[PDB]
Amino acid sequence: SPPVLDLGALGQDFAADPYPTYARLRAEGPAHRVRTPEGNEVWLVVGYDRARAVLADPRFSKDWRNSTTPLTEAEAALNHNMLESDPPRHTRLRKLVAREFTMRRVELLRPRVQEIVDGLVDAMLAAPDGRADLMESLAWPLPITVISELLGVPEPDRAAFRVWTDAFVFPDDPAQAQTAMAEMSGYLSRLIDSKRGQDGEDLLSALVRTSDEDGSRLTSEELLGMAHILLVAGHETTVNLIANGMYALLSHPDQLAALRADMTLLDGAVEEMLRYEGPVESATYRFPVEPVDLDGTVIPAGDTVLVVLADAHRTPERFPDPHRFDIRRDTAGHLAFGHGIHFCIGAPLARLEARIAVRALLERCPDLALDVSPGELVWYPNPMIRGLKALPIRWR
């Protein structure tokens, strides 16, 4: 029952570089009870083959009615979304927006996305001494603008979102996380209400109309659950991809020039950014419905389980030379977007924003470099999301 390892005792060492610790675990076995820096005791499933199994395994439920851990009031407010569901609710819910996030549909957004990215890079090259934080001026503002537009979040109300979403990455403390969720959940509900009767053409309006017309298709809870899900999962992961990506790029200068000289490598590069430093370090909560034997180790019904995608991707048997960042490696079968029914619905939009951004910095900042001695970067210690506090850069 008790943890064999406390991760928060491992300090910034672990946050900077968690891989050898996961790697240490994988040697020993596939699953390990641990305590997270914020002190919840969870299970970690490690290693590609087993990691992949667990993601698609329906013995593992994403529905909290199956978790022995009780939800707080703020959280219960928001747990009615597809990602925290099993069939059929999951089915009814995903189907409501699937059309929306296909590759083809998204391609009709390339122009606007491009327009946004031009705006921010232009602004960014105007930093007097050729220095600034990539996170602050590109990686955060791009995804939030794009997704806000898709969903009808008015510009004045966007700033608050960096603040709130931060508050449930690493919270300073569990009290600040909770406040965020209520503050946000509160704001989303006004926003949803403000849509009623306004003939918006954005997806939130559309959902409100869908919901109001027939509350058996979408309940008022699920409506809020969706707005949230599509927003957070829209902001946070994309932001960190871009920021993890550029960083992998900037810290291996050979791979940078390679893509700089040949922009056919862009998609590959973005795939290796997801393979190598993907923003989803551990997939979201999983609750075995009955006890599950993973090679001798018996995880009990209703425990919290995390699949460590970060470790999946550093498994040498599935990825030769797992520590080398190689923009041309075969990246197929990576788990960065998950695997199975819950497979990420907005991968195409993610790839799109990232591709455009990575190209824009490379074609518009010659001589771009890390501004900062790499070991002076600071990583959030949360074991779910892989993320930088800041990412200073420079140019000629």
User: Does 235 belong to an annotated binding site?
Assistant: yes
The CA radius of gyration of the chain, in Å to the nearest whole number, is 21
Q: How far apart are CA 97 and CA 111, in angstroms?
A: 22
Residue 231 marked in a binding site: yes
**Which CB, 148 or 255, lies closer to ligand HEM?**
148
Determine contact, residues 46/18, Cβ cutoff 8 Å. Answer: no
Q: How far from chain centre, in Å, is Cα 349?
A: 13
178 annotated to a ligand binding site: yes
- Is residue 312 within the footprint of ligand HEM (CB under 6 A)? no
Which residue, 233, 374, 312, is CA-closest to 55? 312
> Does 177 count as an annotated binding residue?
yes
Residues 72-91 that bind ligand HEM (CB under 6 A): 82-83
Residue 113's region, left for phi above 0, alpha for psi from -120 to 50, else beta, is alpha
d(CA 94, CA 97): 6
387 lies in the binding site for ligand HEM (CB under 6 A): no
Among residues 134, 153, 180, 241, the one that binds ligand HEM under rule CB under 6 A: 241
Interface residue with ligand HEM among 325, 337, 379, 380 (CB under 6 A) is 337
Q: Rounded to the nearest 10 degrees, how much is the dihedral formed by the CA atoms of 109, 187, 387, 242?
A: 10
Q: 376 among the known binding-site residues?
A: no
DSSP state, residue 131: E
Three-state DSSP class for residue 308: coil
- Strand, coil or helix: 6: strand
Q: Which is nearer to ligand HEM, 16 or 344 (CB)?
A: 344
Distance between CA atoms of 52 and 334, rounded to whole angstroms?
9
Query: Which residue of 53, 127, 344, 378 would you call a contact of ligand HEM, by CB under 6 A?
Result: 344
Pairing of strands 297-299, 41-45: unpaired
53 binds ligand HEM (CB under 6 A): no
Tokens encoding 127? 């930093």
233 among annotated binding-site residues: yes
Nearer to ligand HEM, 86 or 133 (CB): 86
- CA within 13 Å, CB half, 98: 11
| Of positions 336, 356, 368, 385, contacts ligand HEM by CB under 6 A | 336
Closest approach, Cβ 11 to ligand HEM, in A, equals: 26
* Cβ neighbours of 391 (radius 10 Å): 23
Nearer CB in complex with ligand HEM: 62/395 = 62
How many amino acids of this chain bind ligand HEM (CB under 6 A)? 26
Residues 270-309 that bind ligand HEM (CB under 6 A): 278-280, 283-284
Is 232 known as a binding-site position? yes
Nearer to ligand HEM, 195 or 342 (CB): 342
Write down the least CB distance from residue 270 to ligand HEM, Å.
Answer: 9
| Binding residues among 86-115 for ligand HEM as defined by CB under 6 A | 94, 101
**CB-based contacts of 55: which residues, under 8 Å, 6+ apart?**
283, 307, 335, 338, 339, 340, 342
Nearer Cβ to ligand HEM, position 350 or 356?
350
Minimum separation from the CB atom of position 230 to ligand HEM (A):
5
Which one of residues 36, 79, 237, 382 is an interface residue with ligand HEM (CB under 6 A)? 237
Q: Is 201 annotated as a binding residue?
A: no
Give, in degrees to the nearest 5, the angle at Cα 208 between 207 and 214: 90
In 113-269 the beta strands, taken as DSSP E runs, fall at: 131-133
Min separation Cβ 303 and ligand HEM, Å: 16
345 binds ligand HEM (CB under 6 A): yes
Q: Does 236 show up as a binding residue in the annotation? A: yes
Contact status, residue 335 vs residue 309, Cβ threshold 8 Å? yes
* Rounded Cα gap, residues 351 and 267, in angstroms: 8
181 is in an annotated binding site: yes
Contacts (CB under 6 A) with ligand HEM, residues 204-233:
229-230, 233
* Footprint of ligand HEM (CB under 6 A): 55, 82-83, 94, 101, 229-230, 233-234, 237-238, 241, 278-280, 283-284, 336-338, 342, 344-346, 349-350
**Binding site, annotated residues for substrate:** 84, 177-181, 228-236
Binding-site residues for heme, in ranges, read 344
Residues at the binding site are 84, 177-181, 228-236, 344
